[PDB]
Design a protein around this ligand. Structure first.
Ligand SMILES: [Zn+2]
Lengths: 188, 259, 283, 473, 202
C-alpha cells in the first residue's frame, strides 16, 4: 500500500528535528517503493522526500567550529544558506564555466562580479566584494526582515556563472551574496 | 524365614543387586537436600541464584511478555560463561580421562559389542570397592584395551568433541543393546557430580540444570553430524530465560536484585 | 604517582589546545590534577559542557529511536483501519503520541541550540582570557627579570618562569583571593627559587603581579556565570532523557496492541543497537 | 526369588516371587478401608531396591501419597529419578508465571512416530468407523506437518482442527492456517498425505464443491455425531490442565520412563466423582504407556533383568482396548503391571467386556479381603500379610524442575553447514590469504599521519594523527 | 610489550574466564596492575575501569608473575577471536587493512572513541574515519563468503574446520585486523569518559 499524502506529511513532521530520523524516513520510503511498484510517480514522490532529507540535514547543522569559539549564526536563513555554500561548493562543483560573471546593477553593466575561482571562501570573497560594490552602486534597500533578514527582492540580476549543470555555482553565489543581501530565495 | 522391614530389606538384598551398595550404609532421609554429597539437583531458580545471573529487566531493552511482572531476567554474559565452563575438559584419549570416566567409558564399550558379561562384572565389583573404603577403577582395564578400537566405538567416539559429550553419546548406543538403567551409577554421585547428571539426562529431552552445557551441545552435534571443538551452548542459555520467566517473584525479594 | 586516565589526558589536553595555552610540558600530569590549581579552573567550564555533551547525546538516541517507531507506522497501516473498528480502538491514542513526539522534537531541539550557544559563548571568552594572560605573562616575564637581573643573587630567566608557574599550581588565586593569599604565593615563588628577601621588593613585585591577578580574576566572574548556566542546561537536559524514555516506552506497548500490524525483529534488532547504553550517567 | 511380598499368616515362612511370573501381570481386589494403597507402595519398594522405576497411577484422589513416595525414593538415593504430574490440582488456575512449580509436564504428542493414531483412536475409547477414518488422516497431515512446520502438537493444535472449515481450507484452498497470523502451503507436500482427508468429506452425506456456507449444513449433522467423543475428550484435556500439556519438551515421555527405569507417580482427581472426564484423564496414561510400547518402540535387545512394575490403581475407569497383553517387541523391557480395583463386582461393573481380558491375562490374582489379603495362585492359595513399608515422612518435598533445551534452529545450521563448506574449499586450494588491493582516501590519510609522526607513545601518537587529519580536512 | 596475534585457540576461553572468577587470578590481578600502572602493554591504554590480564605464552594455567601482562579491553578480546561479540560484552568486525599493525589499530581506535564520546570538536572527523574502517569489512566478507565477517563466526569456521598450525593460521589471518566496534562498547566508552571528566572537573 502506498501511504496517503496526509499520513506522509505527518511522517515528515515527526521527523523534522534530527538528521538521522529524516534520512531514515527517506530510506524507508525509497525501500518500500522499490520493493513495491516503484512507479515513475512513485519515483517522483521519492525525489520529493529525498529533497526533504537533504533539506533537514541542510538546515540543522552549521557547527562552524563552535568549539573553536565562533558561534552558530542563529537566524536560520543564514545557517541554511551557509550550509548550502558548503555542500555545493564542496562536493558538486568543479569548473561549471570557468570565470564568467555578469550580475548587473539595475540596467547598468558596470558593477559586475569579477568571475574569480570557485574555491572555498574564494568565490565567497569575490561575491562579497561584488556585493559590496553593488551596494556602492545602490546600498541595501530596507525591504523587510525575518529574524535577521535584509532583502532586495527584485534585485538587479540573478545569474552570474551559469550552465545547465551550474546549479552548484549559481547556488553558491546566491548564498555568499545573500549572507547579507538576499533577493528572498527562501522557502520551506 | 522372618518378617522384614524397609531398612532390613535394604541390607538383605544389596548383595544380589550391587547397584545399591553405595547407599545401604547410609540414612539419607534425615539429611537435607541442597546440602552435602547426596543433594538434589538445582531448579533453574536455585541455580541462577547460586551463580548470580539475575537482573531486573528494563523495558525497551528486553521486551517482557505483557502478562508478566514480579519475575527476573538473566544476564547472558555471565550465563554463557557459566554454561561453557560446564563443558568437560577436551577429549584427547581414553587413556587420558578422569579415573572414573575411564570406568564408565569401559562399561558402555563392552555393551556396544554385546559382550555383556564383560561389562556386568565391571559394575558389580566397582561398588563393592567403593562401599568399602576407596574404589579402584583399575579393575576395568582388560575390557578397555580390548574394544578401544572396535568399529562401532570409533564411529561413536571420533564424532564428538568433549569428554562429557562422548561419554554421554556412547551410552546413547550402549543402551540400544538392551537396557543400561542409570541406577547402576550410584557410586558415581559423590565421587563426581557433573558426570552423574550428564549420564542421567541422556535419554531424556530435558536436562537438569546442573548439566545444561553438555546437554545443549550433545544435541547440537547430534544434529549437525559433526564434531565441533567450540562450545555450542547458544540454546541452553535460551532455555534458562524461559525457565526463569516462570517463577513468580515476591516483591520483597524483587527489589534485592539489581540491573 | 597519581596519573591521569588516558581518556582524560586526550580530553584534558585537547581543550587546552583550543585555548592555545600549552605552557606546561610535563606538569600537565601535576597541574590539571592538583585541586588548588589554576589550569583546572580555566578547564572546569568547558569540561562540564562536555559532560552535558553526552547526556544530550544519550537522550537524543531515544529521540532518534522514537521517531523511527512512528515513521514505520505512519508509512504503512494508518488509514486501512476504518473509523469505528478495533483499528481506531487505540489508533487515536497513537495519533496523540505523534503530537507529543512532535513537540518534544521542537523543544529538545531548542536545547541543542542553547548548548551550542553555551559552548560558543563560553569558549569565545575563555580563549579571550588565556591569550591575554600569555601576553600579560610575557610582560611580567621580562619585567620580573629586570627586577631580578638587578639582584646581586644571580638567577636565570627560564628558571624563574618555571618558578612562577609552580606558584599558581601549588596555591590557587582564582577563587580564594585576598591580600594575604598573594603573600603565600609570593613566599611560594621565593621558596621555589633558592633564596630572596626583598622587603621593599615584596612591595616592588606586588605591583607587577597585578596584571596576572586582574586577568586571573576575570576567570572567577566569568566562572560566576557559566557554572550557573550549566547546571540549568544540564538539569533541563537530564529531564529530556526521562520523558523521551517514556514516549519511547508508551509507544512500544500502545503500538504493540494493533491487530494487523507489527514491528518485525529484523529492523528492530538493528534500530535497537544504539540503545544499549546506561541512563544514570549524570548524577 | 527376587521380589518379596510377604509372610504366610499361618506358619511364618515368607513368600517371594520370581521374575518369570512377576512379568505376568498381577491383579488386586479390595475395599478402600482395607489399606490397599500402602500395598501399592510397599510393593513399589520391592522394585525400587534393585534399580527399576515403578509407575504409580492413583485416581483415589490421594494428595498424601507423593509425600510417602518421595520419602521412599529419597531413601534410595535416586532422588533424581522422579517425575510427578499432578492432575488433582486446579482448573485453569495456572496462567503465566507461578508462585511455585506444581507439576511436571506430560505431552505424548510432540515426538511423533505415527503411532499416536494407535493412541488417539484409543484415547477415543458408520459412526465408530468414520471416527477412526477422520482422525487417522489428520494425524498424517499433522504429524507430517510437525516435522518441518512451526507447529507444536499438543492437546490444542489437534483440538483446534476438529472444526471443519479450517480442515476444509486445507482441502479445497490447499492452504494451511494455524492459531497465529500465518500462511502455510501444502502444495509441495506429497499427495500420500492430503488424499485421505480430501476423500473423507466426500464420504459424508453431502458436499457443495464451491463454498462452505452451504455444505456444512449438509454435513454438520454427521460431522458432529462422529467427531463428538473426541472433541469432548480433547475439550477437558487442553483447558483444565494448561500447566501439564501445553509444553513442547515433555519432562516425562514414556519411552524414556521405561527404557531407563525412571519413576513417575501420577495422581488423578477422583474416580467415583464425575468419571465422565476423570476416567478420561487416567486414560491419556495407559493409552501412551501402551501405544508407545506396542508400535512406537525404536538388532536384538536382550531381556531385562529387572521387572518394571507399573501399578495402576483403578483400571476400572480408564481402559484402552486390550492392555493386559504386551506385544512381542517390548518383551525386552521386562515389563509388568499391577492392576487394581475397588471391587470385582464393580470391576466388571466399571466398563464393558474388560475384566475378562485382565482376568485372562494375569497369572496372579489378588483379593484384599479384610491378615491383609490372600493370593489366588494357580496351584495353591496362600493367606498372608503383605509387605509393610512405612517411609518416614519428609520435611520438604521438592519436585525437581528441568529446562527446555532445543536442538538449534535449522535456519542456522543449514547456514553453518553452508559456510563451512565454502570455507573448507578455500582452505584446501591453498590460495587462502587475502590479496586484492583496495585504496581509500581516508585509510591512506590516517596512515600517512601515523607514519610521519615521531612521538613514540602509541596513544599520544594516535591523537596527533587525528589532529593532523582533521586540520587536513 | 609483545605484539598481537589473533589466536583462534579452541579452549583458552574456558580456562581464561575460569580463572577470572577465582582469587588466584585475582590476588595476582592486583599485584600485576600495580607493577604496570594499569597501562595497556600492547596498545598503550591507561585507565582504571575494565582492564584484565592476558597470558603471553598461549597457556592460561601457568600464572607466574612474569608471563602475565595487563592489556586493555580491546586487546584482550583480540586474543580470543574464536568468540567475541558473544561472550557478554566486547564486539568487533574483521576488516582488511594492511597499513596499520594491529596495535596501531587498537590504539588509534581509542582516540576515535574519545573524540566521539566526549566531543571536543573533532567529532565530525572521527566518524568520517571510522566510516572507512567498518566499510572495509565487506572485502573480508567477499573472500570468505557472506555472514562470516564477524569474528565470532570467522573464528568458528577455523577450529571447527580443524586448523592449528602456526603457519596455516598465520597465512590465513594475514592482513586482517580486528576493528573494535563502537556500538557494542558503549557501556564502556562512556563509563571511561564520564569517569574521566568527573575526576578532573569537580
Ligand atoms: Zn590494549
Amino acid at each position: 500500500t502506498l501511504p496517503t499524502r496526509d499520513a506522509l506529511l505527518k511522517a515528515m513532521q515527526v521527523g523534522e528535528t534530527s538528521i538521522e530520523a529524516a534520512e531514515y524516513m527517506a530510506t524507508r520510503f525509497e525501500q518500500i517503493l522499490t520493493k513495491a511498484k516503484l512507479l515513475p510517480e512513485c519515483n517522483d514522490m521519492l525525489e520529493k522526500i529525498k529533497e526533504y532529507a537533504q533539506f533537514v540535514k541542510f538546515k540543522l547543522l552549521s557547527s562552524a567550529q563552535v568549539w573553536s569559539g565562533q558561534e552558530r549564526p542563529t537566524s536560520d536563513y543564514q545557517n541554511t544558506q551557509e550550509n548550502k555554500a558548503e555542500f555545493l561548493a564542496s562536493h558538486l562543483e568543479g569548473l561549471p564555466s570557468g570565470l564568467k560573471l555578469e550580475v548587473a546593477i539595475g540596467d547598468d553593466a558596470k558593477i559586475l562580479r569579477g568571475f574569480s575561482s570557485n574555491g572555498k571562501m574564494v568565490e565567497g570573497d569575490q561575491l562579497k566584494t561584488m556585493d559590496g560594490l553593488l551596494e556602492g552602486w545602490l546600498a541595501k534597500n530596507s525591504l523587510a526582515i525575518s529574524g535577521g533578514a535584509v532583502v532586495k527582492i527584485d534585485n538587479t540580476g540573478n545569474q552570474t556563472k551559469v550552465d545547465p549543470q551550474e546549479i552548484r555555482q549559481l547556488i553558491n553565489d546566491s548564498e555568499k551574496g545573500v549572507a547579507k543581501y538576499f533577493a528572498d530565495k527562501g522557502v520551506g | 524365614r522372618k518378617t522384614y522391614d524397609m531398612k532390613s530389606l535394604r541390607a538383605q538384598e544389596q548383595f544380589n543387586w550391587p547397584a545399591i551398595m553405595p547407599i545401604v550404609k547410609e540414612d539419607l532421609v534425615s539429611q537435607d537436600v541442597n546440602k552435602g554429597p547426596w543433594a538434589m539437583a538445582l531448579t533453574p531458580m536455585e541455580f541462577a541464584r547460586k551463580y548470580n545471573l539475575l537482573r531486573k529487566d528494563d523495558a525497551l531493552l528486553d521486551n517482557p511478555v505483557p502478562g508478566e511482572e514480579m519475575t527476573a531476567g538473566i544476564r547472558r554474559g555471565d550465563a554463557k560463561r557459566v554454561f561453557t565452563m560446564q563443558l568437560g575438559p577436551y577429549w584427547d584419549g581414553f587413556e587420558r580421562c578422569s579415573p572414573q570416566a575411564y570406568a564408565l567409558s569401559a562399561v558402555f564399550m563392552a555393551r556396544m559389542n554385546r559382550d555383556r558379561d564383560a561389562a556386568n562384572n565391571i559394575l558389580k565389583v566397582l561398588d563393592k570397592t567403593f562401599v568399602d573404603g576407596k574404589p579402584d577403577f583399575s579393575v576395568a582395564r582388560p575390557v578397555m584395551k580390548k574394544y578401544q578400537n572396535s568399529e562401532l566405538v570409533q564411529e561413536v567416539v571420533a564424532k564428538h568433541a568433549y569428554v562429557l559429550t562422548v561419554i554421554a553419546s556412547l551410552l546413547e548406543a550402549a543402551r540400544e543393546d538392551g537396557v543400561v538403567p542409570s541406577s547402576e551409577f550410584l557410586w558415581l554421585k559423590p565421587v563426581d557430580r557433573r558426570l552423574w547428571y550428564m549420564l542421567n539426562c541422556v535419554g531424556r529431552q530435558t536436562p537438569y540444570s546442573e548439566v545444561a552445557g553438555p546437554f545443549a551441545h550433545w544435541k547440537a552435534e547430534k544434529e549437525m553430524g559433526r564434531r565441533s571443538l567450540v562450545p555450542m551452548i547458544d540454546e541452553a542459555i535460551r532455555a534458562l530465560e524461559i525457565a526463569v520467566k516462570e517463577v513468580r517473584l515476591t516483591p520483597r525479594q524483587m527489589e534485592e536484585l539489581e540491573p | 604517582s597519581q596519573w591521569l586516565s588516558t581518556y582524560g589526558t586526550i580530553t584534558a589536553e585537547r581543550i587546552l589546545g583550543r585555548y592555545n595555552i600549552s605552557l606546561p610540558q610535563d606538569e600537565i600530569l601535576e597541574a590539571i590534577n592538583i585541586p588548588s590549581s589554576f589550569y583546572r579552573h580555566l578547564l572546569q567550564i568547558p569540561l562540564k559542557n562536555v559532560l552535558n555533551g553526552i547526556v544530550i547525546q544519550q537522550a537524543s538516541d531515544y529521540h532518534v529511536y522514537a521517531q523511527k517507531l512512528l515513521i514505520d507506522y505512519l508509512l504503512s497501516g494508518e488509514s486501512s483501519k476504518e473509523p469505528d473498528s478495533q483499528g481506531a480502538g487505540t489508533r487515536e491514542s497513537l495519533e496523540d503520541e505523534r503530537q507529543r513526539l512532535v513537540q518534544l522534537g521542537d523543544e529538545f531541539h531548542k536545547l541543542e541550540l542553547e548548548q551550542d550557544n553555551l559552548i560558543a559563548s563560553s569558549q569565545a571568552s575563555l580563549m579571550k582570557i588565556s591569550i591575554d594572560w600569555n601576553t600579560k605573562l610575557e610582560t611580567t616575564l621580562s619585567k620580573l627579570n629586570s627586577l631580578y637581573k638587578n639582584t646581586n643573587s644571580k638567577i636565570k630567566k627560564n628558571a624563574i618562569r618555571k618558578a612562577l608557574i609552580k606558584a599558581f599550581i601549588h596555591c590557587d588565586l582564582v577563587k580564594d583571593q585576598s591580600q594575604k593569599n598573594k603573600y603565600q604565593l609570593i613566599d611560594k615563588l621565593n621558596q621555589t627559587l633558592a633564596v630572596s628577601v626583598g622587603a621593599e621588593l615584596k612591595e616592588s613585585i606586588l605591583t607587577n603581579l597585578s596584571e596576572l591577578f586582574q586577568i586571573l580574576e576575570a576567570l572567577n566572574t566569568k566562572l560566576d556565570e557559566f557554572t550557573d548556566r550549566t547546571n540549568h542546561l544540564s538539569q533541563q537536559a537530564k529531564s529530556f532523557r526521562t520523558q523521551f524514555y517514556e514516549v519511547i516506552l508508551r509507544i512500544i506497548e500502545l503500538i504493540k496492541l494493533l491487530p494487523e500490524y507489527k514491528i518485525d525483529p529484523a529492523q528492530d534488532a538493528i534500530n535497537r543497537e544504539p540503545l544499549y547504553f546506561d541512563r544514570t550517567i549524570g548524577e | 526369588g527376587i521380589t518379596f511380598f510377604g509372610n504366610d499368616r499361618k506358619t511364618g515362612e515368607e513368600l517371594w516371587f520370581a521374575n518369570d511370573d512377576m512379568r505376568t501381570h498381577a491383579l488386586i481386589f479390595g475395599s478402600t478401608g482395607s489399606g490397599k494403597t500402602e500395598t501399592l507402595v510397599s510393593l513399589s519398594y520391592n522394585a525400587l531396591v534393585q534399580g527399576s522405576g515403578f509407575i504409580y497411577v492413583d485416581g483415589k484422589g490421594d494428595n498424601s501419597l507423593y509425600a510417602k513416595v518421595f520419602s521412599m525414593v529419597r531413601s534410595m538415593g535416586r532422588e533424581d529419578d522422579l517425575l510427578l504430574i499432578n492432575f488433582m490440582t486446579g482448573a485453569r488456575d495456572i496462567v503465566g508465571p507461578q508462585e511455585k512449580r506444581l507439576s511436571n509436564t506430560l505431552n505424548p504428542f510432540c515426538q511423533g512416530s505415527s503411532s499416536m493414531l494407535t493412541q488417539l483412536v484409543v484415547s477415543l475409547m458408520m459412526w465408530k468407523g468414520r471416527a477412526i477414518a477422520f482422525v487417522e488422516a489428520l494425524m498424517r497431515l499433522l504429524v507430517y506437518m510437525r516435522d518441518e512446520g512451526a507447529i507444536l502438537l499438543d492437546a490444542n493444535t489437534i483440538r483446534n482442527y476438529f472444526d471443519l472449515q479450517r480442515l476444509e481450507s486445507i482441502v479445497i484452498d490447499k492452504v494451511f492456517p494455524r492459531d497465529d497470523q500465518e500462511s502455510v502451503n501444502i502444495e509441495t507436500i506429497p499427495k500420500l498425505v492430503t488424499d485421505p482427508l480430501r476423500n473423507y468429506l466426500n464420504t459424508l452425506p453431502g458436499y457443495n464443491k464451491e463454498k462452505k456456507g452451504k455444505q456444512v449444513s449438509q454435513v454438520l449433522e454427521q460431522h458432529g455425531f462422529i467427531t463428538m467423543q473426541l472433541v469432548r475428550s480433547f475439550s477437558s484435556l487442553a483447558d483444565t490442565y494448561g500447566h501439564i500439556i501445553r509444553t513442547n519438551l515433555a519432562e516425562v515421555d514414556f519411552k524414556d520412563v521405561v527404557l531407563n527405569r525412571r519413576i513417575l507417580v501420577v495422581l488423578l482427581p477422583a474416580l467415583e466423582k464425575s468419571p465422565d472426564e476423570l476416567s478420561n484423564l487416567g486414560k491419556i496414561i495407559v493409552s501412551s504407556l501402551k501405544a508407545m510400547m506396542a508400535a512406537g518402540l525404536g538388532r536384538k535387545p536382550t531381556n531385562a533383568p529387572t521387572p518394571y512394575m507399573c501399578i495402576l490403581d483403578e483400571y476400572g475407569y480408564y481402559a484402552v482396548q486390550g492392555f493386559a497383553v504386551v506385544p512381542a517387541q517390548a518383551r525386552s523391557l521386562g515389563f509388568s503391571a499391577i492392576f487394581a480395583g475397588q471391587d470385582l463386582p464393580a470391576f466388571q461393573k466399571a466398563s464393558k467386556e474388560e475384566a475378562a481380558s485382565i482376568g485372562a491375562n494375569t497369572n496372579i490374582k489378588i483379593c484384599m479381603k479384610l491378615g491383609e489379603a490372600h493370593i489366588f495362585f494357580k496351584s495353591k492359595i496362600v493367606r498372608a500379610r503383605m509387605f509393610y513399608a512405612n517411609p518416614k515422612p519428609v520435611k520438604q518435598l521438592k519436585i525437581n524442575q528441568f529446562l527446555k533445551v532445543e536442538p538449534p534452529p535449522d535456519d542456522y545450521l543449514m547456514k553453518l553447514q553452508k559456510q563451512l563448506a565454502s570455507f573448507q574449499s578455500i582452505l584446501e586450494s591453498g590460495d587462502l590469504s587475502i590479496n586484492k588491493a583496495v585504496e581509500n582516501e581516508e585509510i591512506t590519510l590516517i596512515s600517512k599521519a601515523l607514519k610521519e609522526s615521531t612521538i613514540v607513545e602509541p596513544i599520544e601518537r594516535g591523537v596527533a594523527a587525528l589532529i593532523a587529519f582533521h586540520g587536513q580536512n | 610489550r609483545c605484539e598481537l596475534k589473533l589466536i583462534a585457540s579452541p579452549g583458552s576461553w574456558r580456562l581464561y574466564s575460569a580463572r577470572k572468577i577465582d582469587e588466584r587470578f585475582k590476588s595476582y590481578e592486583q599485584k600485576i596492575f600495580q607493577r604496570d600502572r594499569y597501562t595497556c602493554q600492547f596498545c598503550g591504554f591507561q585507565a582504571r575501569l575494565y582492564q584484565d590480564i592476558v597470558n603471553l605464552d598461549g597457556d592460561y594455567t601457568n600464572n607466574r608473575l612474569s608471563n602475565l601482562v595487563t592489556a586493555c579491553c580491546f586487546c584482550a578480546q583480540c586474543f580470543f577471536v574464536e568468540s567475541v561479540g558473544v561472550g557478554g560484552y566486547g564486539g568487533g568486525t574483521l576488516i582488511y587493512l594492511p597499513e596499520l599493525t594491529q596495535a596501531e589499530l587498537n590504539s588509534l581506535c581509542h582516540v576515535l572513541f574519545c573524540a566521539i564520546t566526549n566531543d571536543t570538536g573533532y567529532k565530525s572527523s572521527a566518524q568520517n574515519i571510522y566510516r572507512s574502517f567498518k566499510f572495509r569489512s565487506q572485502i573480508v566478507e567477499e573472500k570468505f563468503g557472506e555472514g562470516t565477517s564477524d569474528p565470532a563466526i570467522f573464528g568458528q569456521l577455523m577450529i571447527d574446520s580443524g586448523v592449528n598450525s602456526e603457519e596455516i593460521r598465520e597465512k590465513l589471518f594475514k592482513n586482517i585486523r580486528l576493528l573494535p566496534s563502537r556500538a557494542k562498547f558503549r557501556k564502556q566508552i562512556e563509563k571511561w569518559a564520564a569517569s574521566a571528566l568527573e575526576e578532573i572537573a569537580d
